[PDB]
């Protein structure tokens, strides 16, 4: 019976031009 | 003739300037018509097939929004980061050397040209804080003359007489707290303040349209709360940065926290939620911190003053505390007069005894309605209350009367009159319709009482000296 | 003969235009055939080898799609977010400037040109907020004629002759609160009035949201869900058509903001809804209908006049209402016993009406054959509460279903295609053989209310 | 902008200003004696007390003094002078991503250690660190502090430590502060800010009721134009009225768990901010009277009735004996207070 707060974890992403 | 465009980088005394176009920089001479000194940094120019600078202008187009981090020592270049955490320095344009720049300000940049052109206002604030101007004005509010005068002196008075305040070395209040029982009217006062502020800037200043919308940032209570860490604090900081940058010399900005009785929490309380420990200190530091705001007014509306954190209620943050009480007889008469105008369809039979004097008839009807509503008879007996001492105290409907209840009674009477017009066919409004509406409204609220009801203990137990422990509905059937 | 294409940017007083083509902006002149006044921003223009605009068509239908973040105050630009959280300030085409664009809308854009062409509808946002078509009518509801009249007066009339209201300066009601004992038909009235309003217009939209569906594990999600629901309602009502929003089982969520539950998040959910109804921004054509069998548990701030001002109390059906419900759930087409048909000489309507009358007479009786509960009050008086004080509509439905099941058993055992009155008579007493949730623990709140009606507190409950 | 306040604008705090000067200014004014005695400047300073009692005032006065010192020592550039004071503004470090607030703290402390030059202190002020200050187990909604606190306390003192950087923290909820950070070697000086007494109230009023404020001619008539004497007499009368045990000054009745009864006046819940608000309200009444009647002048009755107006405005704000300040008095009595009732009319 309690609430939570989220911390994100960024995922790798890369593009060319 | 077909022609292209380019971005000006720098100007030289040799009547030659650097222009970036087609992905490359070239040093080209200007046409005789245009003046070299007239051109500024960061503004676009129009080229030709022979690459002759013929026309000037300014750049207003698309561009990746960059987060400004810091300003370099020379003051003409700025470091910005992009979406992919790419850090790069860019020449500042002429219109950016306006309010002083701050870290984290969004900027419009062109990576190929390397120039920052303008600061984009934060999206997290503008799309939500702004609201449409209500029609409510100070005229449409009755029974709160002292409260209206106090809020006027707290908000509008200091900025009308600036020299007088400067002579005494006085500053406008840094916070107003509106509080009272439900239905007594606080959002109405907020609407009146917003309408007055919009009227002041749209006409007396007359800058441009939609500018009055920009001021009076209205934010609902829980809407700042969100499922993340630091997001609510970021929203608060962005709101106060916008307020600080929009606050001018004598031009006020009002931040209205609707439903401040639950201002994200009461600190040190709340089993289900613990966001207070991070949201309350941020707000406490923004207002009256190491660096303080100049012309920003914070207004909050509350129904439970006790549930607001004490550190924010102390003077210096919420200075003027305005209390709205339940209407008495004179205030009830004023409130009724605010709705029963002389423009309603009035029954001929009801005007028969007044010889067509509609205003006198309306005044007499209001007096009769007030007398019926505030009569001390068994019909008006609503509840009985028992306390620790056990003294049974009777509570009438007058102890729960409010402007909202008066408006509801008037609307119900109008509906009854419309029903009578539809069925019988005789047009107009009758006093008996008002009496029937009062009876129905009083009878419809017999199921409201429960084991415990707040908003009245703090007014009853203070005089009685004992806490309310039992509530019973009186004679019915 | 070959001709290219470009994106128009703006118009000039010199009868010249700006065209984006091949990733570059150029200054062009319109051909004498076309008129420069008719041109619009973002419109595709046909070029030629001489770089002259000769024809302008429609807008491009392909490209990237981005989420709208905000509209700038200048009214000609919009800040949007790309797929990888890249933020762009792009121009708005003529069609963009129905309702005005809101944050979260999807726009068809091309980054190189930097224009937003068309608002692309999204199916996910439509599916998130359900809008079903109610089918229950006023006919399906019986025994609540006066309540139907009240809800017609509070909903149907303000929109039937709204010009009369404007002449009288009357504000249409903003909130209706249905309350009463469970199983008395709270949802049916809302569905019926929604269907009637949908048929009355000659267009409306109805939003139904349940109680527990507005509860999330995290903090800050229920409030934004409510905000999105009300934003959708405002978007639908901006055209002027009335919009009905129905909250189901308000007892569970946003209870009393005071003590209430010793451990609940309610204190941060009710005010938001309040700010959505009464606030600096006021909704115009939105009606909020709430239904709760526990009216005392609802927040008094919500029940304040002006928000949910209209209050309707449903009561348990009496004998006439029970007969009406039985008539609603027993039609002439329903098979009946051959013996009854012969007795009535083919008058099927008379047969079913007589059977209904017999059933309702059996249900309402003070004989000790229909004993339900024993109640002892504070004074110590023992009273036998029979079925007459607990005849809910759902109970009647269960009785009819059990009787029909018994009829199926009889027809599969014997073979005669008919329904016997004895089937319903036995189903009446077999209804309470299985619990219908009417009995409860020692001191229920419903029985406390019944005692308050009686005047002596109920202390003892015994099954009979 | 560095605040324009100075140490001369703070009244009623004499020992506290001496302590804050000894913690910061003294070690750098007399480096030779400190080297002789093998003494290093205190690593941390803590300010706490009831709200509105002047913690942020000291925090900004010390920043102004540091800015003036750096201007008169290194150079007249404003940015370099201001760069030696750092402001946290509360929970600014918290970030959505995992492990980014720790990186920000590490960057802050490494830059701070690089800035110090053994003659120039670097001051980092944690404004209302009650958010960061958590006992690592009291979290209910989130426990980002479980990661933030170890990073900060390891940066402060560890195998690689800061030499000449002063960490100043200001707090109102000392109980919520983590015990580890409340340790000698991390917060050496514990300055407690107390609510003003009679002499402190007089000093604060003198700081706010300057002799340059216009005064009504009738008031100066008694003192024959002696502005200073009239103003000090008015201040004495105001402080006597406010700090008086009158039946009109009864504020709250306090009942503890043990059952002891205590009558508390409005003077118990007093602070410098309240005095400033009273003065501002009196000035507002004076300017309103000037506008209405056309005659300038601030009178004593304006102060006298502004006092009662303010006391009536803040006369009812209790909430289930929240131990903001009741903890100390309850410890004096022996058990936590549980019952209170407002003594109004
Ligand atoms: N002079 C008046 N005093 C009180 N109420 C008024 C007055 N004039 C109009 N009203 C009516 O009272 C109603 C309630 O006002 P308002 O919405 O400000 O209450 P509220 O402070 O929002 O209540 P809560 O804080 O419980 O939400 C309004 O709809 C308005 O029409
Ligand atoms: N006139 C009527 N009065 C009461 N109930 C009826 C009536 N007609 C049909 N019913 C039956 O009552 C049942 C319940 O209707 P409805 O959904 O409106 O109330 P409910 O929300 O289920 O009640 P509860 O709040 O106890 O869940 C329906 O299944 C329907 O078959
Ligand atoms: N000598 C003094 N003692 C206390 N307060 C004073 C004094 N002189 C002025 N003040 C006023 O008190 C107000 C509050 O002081 P300060 O901001 O330093 O503490 P605070 O930040 O309110 O404390 P908290 O953060 O606990 O609320 C200031 O606005 C200042 O004008
Ligand atoms: Mg309100
Ligand atoms: Mg239902
Ligand atoms: Mg402070």
UniProtKB/TrEMBL annotation, chain A:
Is modified by deamidation of its C-terminal glutamine to glutamate by the deamidase Dop, a prerequisite to the subsequent pupylation process. The N-terminal unstructured half of Pup provides a signal required to initiate unfolding and degradation by the proteasome but is not needed for pupylation, while the C-terminal helical half of Pup interacts with ARC to target proteins to the proteasome. Protein modifier that is covalently attached to lysine residues of substrate proteins, thereby targeting them for proteasomal degradation. The tagging system is termed pupylation. Belongs to the prokaryotic ubiquitin-like protein family. Strongly interacts with the proteasome-associated ATPase ARC through a hydrophobic interface; the interacting region of Pup lies in its C-terminal half. There is one Pup binding site per ARC hexamer ring. This is Prokaryotic ubiquitin-like protein Pup. It comes from Mycobacterium tuberculosis.
From TrEMBL, chain C:
Keywords: ATP-binding, Chaperone, Coiled coil, Nucleotide-binding, Proteasome. One of its GO terms (cellular component) is proteasome-activating nucleotidase complex. The keyword RNA-binding does not apply. It comes from the Bacteria. The keyword Lipid metabolism does not apply. Residues 172-318 form the AAA+ ATPase domain. GO terms for molecular function: ATP binding; ATP hydrolysis activity. ATP binds at residues 183-188. One of its GO terms (biological process) is modification-dependent protein catabolic process. Homohexamer. Assembles into a hexameric ring structure. Belongs to the AAA ATPase family. This is AAA ATPase forming ring-shaped complexes. It comes from Mycobacterium tuberculosis. The lineage of its organism: Bacteria, Bacillati, Actinomycetota, Actinomycetes, Mycobacteriales. The gene is mpa.
């Amino acid at each position: 019976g309690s609430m939570a707060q989220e911390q994100t974890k960024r995922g790798g992403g890369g593009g060319d031009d | 003739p077909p022609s292209g465009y380019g971005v000006l980088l720098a100007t030289h005394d040799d009547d030659t300037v650097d222009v970036f176009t087609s992905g490359r920089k070239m040093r080209l001479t200007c046409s005789p018509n245009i003046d070299a000194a007239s051109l500024k940094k960061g503004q676009t120019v129009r080229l030709n097939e022979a690459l002759t600078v013929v026309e000037a202008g300014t750049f207003e187009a698309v561009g990746e929004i960059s987060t400004l981090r810091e300003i370099l020592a020379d003051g003409h270049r700025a470091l910005v980061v992009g979406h992919a955490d790419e850090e790069r320095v860019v020449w500042l344009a002429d219109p950016l050397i306006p309010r002083k720049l701050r870290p984290g300000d969004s900027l419009l940049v062109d990576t190929k040209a390397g120039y920052a052109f303008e600061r984009i206002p934060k999206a997290e604030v503008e799309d939500l804080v702004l609201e449409e101007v209500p029609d409510v004005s100070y005229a449409d509010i009755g029974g709160l003359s002292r409260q209206i005068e106090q809020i006027r002196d707290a908000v509008e008075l200091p900025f009308l007489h600036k020299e007088l305040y400067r002579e005494y070395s006085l500053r406008p209040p840094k916070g107003v707290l509106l509080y009272g029982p439900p239905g007594c009217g606080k959002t109405l006062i907020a609407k009146a303040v917003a309408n007055s502020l919009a009227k002041k800037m749209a006409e007396v200043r007359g800058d441009d349209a939609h500018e009055a919308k920009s001021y009076f940032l209205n934010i609902k209570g829980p809407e700042l709360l969100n499922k993340f860490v630091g997001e609510t604090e970021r929203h608060i900081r962005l709101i106060f940065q916008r307020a600080r940058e929009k606050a001018s010399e004598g031009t006020p900005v009002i931040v209205f926290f609707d439903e401040m009785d639950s201002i994200f929490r009461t600190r040190g309380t709340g089993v289900s939620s613990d966001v207070e420990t991070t949201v309350v200190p941020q707000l406490l530091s923004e207002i009256d911190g190491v660096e303080g705001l100049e012309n920003v007014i914070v207004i909050g509306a509350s129904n439970r003053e006790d549930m607001i954190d004490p550190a924010i209620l102390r003077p210096g943050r919420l200075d003027v505390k305005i209390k709205i009480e339940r209407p008495d007889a004179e205030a009830a008469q004023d409130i009724y007069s605010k709705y029963l105008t002389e423009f309603l369809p009035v029954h001929a039979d009801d005007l028969a005894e007044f010889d067509g004097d509609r205003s006198a008839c309306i005044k007499a009807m209001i007096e009769k309605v007030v007398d019926r509503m505030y009569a001390e008879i068994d019909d008006n007996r609503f509840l009985e209350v028992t306390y620790a001492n056990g003294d049974k105290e009777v509570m009438y409907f007058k102890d729960f009367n409010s402007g909202a209840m008066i408006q509801n009674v008037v609307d119900r009477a109008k509906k009854n009159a419309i029903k009578s017009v539809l069925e019988t066919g005789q047009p107009g409004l009758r006093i008996q319709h008002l009496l029937d509406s009062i009876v129905d409204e009083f009878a419809e609220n017999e199921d409201l009482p429960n084991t415990t009801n707040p908003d009245d203990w703090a007014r009853i137990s203070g005089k009685k000296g004992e806490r309310i422990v039992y509530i019973r509905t009186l004679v019915t059937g």
